[PDB]
Design a protein around this ligand. Structure first.
Ligand SMILES: Nc1ncnc2c1ncn2[C@@H]1O[C@H](COP(=O)(O)OP(=O)(O)CP(=O)(O)O)[C@@H](O)[C@H]1O
Ligand SMILES: Nc1ncnc2c1ncn2[C@@H]1O[C@H](COP(=O)(O)OP(=O)(O)CP(=O)(O)O)[C@@H](O)[C@H]1O
Ligand SMILES: *Cc1c(COP(=O)(O)O)cnc(C)c1O
Ligand SMILES: *Cc1c(COP(=O)(O)O)cnc(C)c1O
Ligand SMILES: [Mg+2]
Ligand SMILES: [Mg+2]
Ligand SMILES: [Mg+2]
Ligand SMILES: [Mg+2]
Lengths: 318, 318
């Protein structure tokens, strides 16, 4: 019913031949600011540009021959789509990707570069799911959840696992929260390598459905939030994700878009790395409570760096 | 409080030096199908490509010197934006246009070609209104409603006025319904030239907030509908529009996207004209009740032809 550190440890072994052991970056500037030692696990450097490659590969690596021969299909507007496209190509599995007619050029080219078969639909009529069900059932294609799947969350969790192995136990771990895949998997690693670690999920304040769920004790749904963290606009947590979250997550924090923008610029000018808006949640939340992190070892996950260069330029000049 | 045919008649005089007297097209094929005579007022041929030029010009032509010197601002994702841009340029009024970072190239080029000063914002964070209020108040800019304004609806109404003048009284008139500007103004012309005319507004079935309002007797709001009629995705009717609608509109009809697509292809292959999805509502509704239109004279308004060539190609091949 629920994955454990073991699955994360196995996922590590299962994806080792293809995943990147992303670097852990450090900033003397950040440390002085926090009066502590901060560690950044940079998944923006992961294959495809986001941690998602982990969960996607782990899940696809566990499909049977019939499914692998038939292929998979994805319709997510987020990083999961290219995570699936690239993993599928790596594993010799055909992949169909449903994208909006006006999808960013770079993302479309990336997807075709990964061998994905692009099927387009009109954004104004978001009947993606309808199309996905019709197509996947008619062609016997498999659809891997972007977060609410035991194999997917175990894979995402391998990023946290690697962090600790390189740096060691931690007092706190800040992780981006959308559907909960990264959050749940990261919790499994944390509780193992450093049982005395405060684990925080972070959501854009305009969409704290996760926070309400955490407090309510049951999954709460909300209208799609208006925020620049395009990768964290989910409307509700997943069953498998929330279960692990309510039992291993200490608390869900929220940050404003203004803070995300400040973090995005800091990463670029001060750390020289490109990070997408959603990937700034964890750092923003951490900075907000730095006064409470004196002389501790903090971990910050940078979920990804796939930001349309135009939006990136736009935010950098804000 | 409410405009009358008179305002429509004056609007006609007020915009005459710049608006196009769009043609009325006829199809023997459509007539045989309906066992009647059908008349198409083609506003896709209007300046800027949509009827909106009428209401925009009429409204801007009535601003005082201080406002004209200060300029206007628009943030609509629909045809109203370019209607304002072009009208403002024609009248020597500066215009600032708020558009999404990923707005279609052609629309952006059209807007700059009309002398509009483009200000972009991130689509994922739709804080347009916030920005519009801050900017318009700080620079003393005027914002003309896309439909809920007496001057705007009177202008839109001039299209219906011209139809009757060229063809004569009608038993029925089918008009696209979004916010109600075109619907209300058209009602004023109809009741004048042909008091015995059935006037129908038409909305995409997925967003019949107008229909519910018409039945409820009071404006009903709804979540943005998923439909290809991008120009009719409004969430509620306007005060001035609904008032005229409840008193001069016989009934609000709805059609499916499938029907819109069929009409779009018919216009292209059978009538050789380019029409945007939203501009197909009225024709679709009419075809659906053609059995009830035998030996009558029907009027059909084609609201516009501004469809991204990519979506157009996509729909044509559906
Ligand atoms: N054809 C294309 N056009 C534009 N962007 C592309 C692209 N193909 C890939 N990308 C993007 O460029 C980056 C490429 O990452 P990718 O992870 O596939 O390999 P690399 O070549 O960087 C891997 P490695 O460092 O692990 O050897 C990603 O952020 C991806 O979204
Ligand atoms: N630079 C540009 N790039 C792409 N499309 C443009 C454009 N400038 C205008 N358009 C579009 O092309 C069409 C141009 O209409 P416009 O009404 O301004 O003049 P015309 O040159 O067709 C007027 P007229 O026939 O009344 O003399 C519209 O549908 C508009 O949206
Ligand atoms: C998918 C994604 C997230 C959210 O992860 P979940 O497992 O849905 O909570 C955060 N940041 C980026 C860059 C993502 O692609
Ligand atoms: C704006 C628009 C409509 C809707 O008109 P309203 O006055 O909002 O009801 C319909 N079709 C097109 C092409 C439009 O641009
Ligand atoms: Mg790389
Ligand atoms: Mg949320
Ligand atoms: Mg023309
Ligand atoms: Mg409606």
């Amino acid at each position: 019913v629920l994955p454990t550190y073991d699955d994360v440890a196995s996922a590590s072994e299962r994806i080792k031949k293809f995943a990147n052991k992303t670097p852990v970056l450090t900033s003397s500037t950040v440390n002085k600011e926090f009066v502590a030692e901060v560690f950044f696990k940079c998944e923006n450097f992961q294959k495809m540009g986001a941690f998602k490659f982990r969960g996607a590969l782990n899940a696809l690596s566990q499909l049977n021959e019939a499914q692998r021969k038939a292929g998979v299909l994805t319709f997510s507007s987020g990083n999961h789509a290219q995570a699936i496209a690239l993993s599928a190509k790596i594993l010799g599995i055909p992949a169909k990707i449903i994208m909006p007619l006006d999808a960013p050029e770079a993302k479309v080219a990336a997807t075709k570069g990964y061998g994905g078969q692009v099927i387009m639909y009109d954004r104004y009529k978001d009947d993606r799911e309808k199309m996905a069900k019709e197509i996947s059932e008619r062609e016997g294609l498999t659809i891997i959840p972007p977060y609410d799947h035991p194999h997917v969350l175990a894979g995402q969790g391998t990023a946290a696992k690697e962090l600790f192995e390189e740096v060691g136990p931690l007092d706190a771990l800040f992780v981006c929260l959308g559907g909960g895949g990264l959050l749940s998997g990261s919790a499994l690693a944390a509780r193992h390598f450093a049982p005395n670690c405060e684990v925080y999920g972070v959501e854009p304040e305009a969409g704290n459905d996760g926070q309400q769920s955490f407090r309510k004790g049951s999954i709460v749904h909300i209208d799609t939030p208006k925020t620049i963290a395009d990768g964290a606009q989910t409307q509700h947590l997943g069953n498998y994700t929330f279960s692990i979250i309510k039992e291993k997550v200490d608390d869900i924090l929220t940050v404003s878009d203004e803070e995300l923008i400040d973090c995005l610029k800091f990463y670029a000018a001060r750390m020289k790395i490109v990070v997408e808006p959603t990937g700034c949640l964890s750092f923003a939340a951490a900075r907000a409570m730095k006064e409470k992190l004196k002389n501790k070892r903090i971990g910050i996950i940078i979920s990804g760096g796939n930001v349309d260069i135009e939006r990136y330029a736009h935010f950098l000049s804000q």
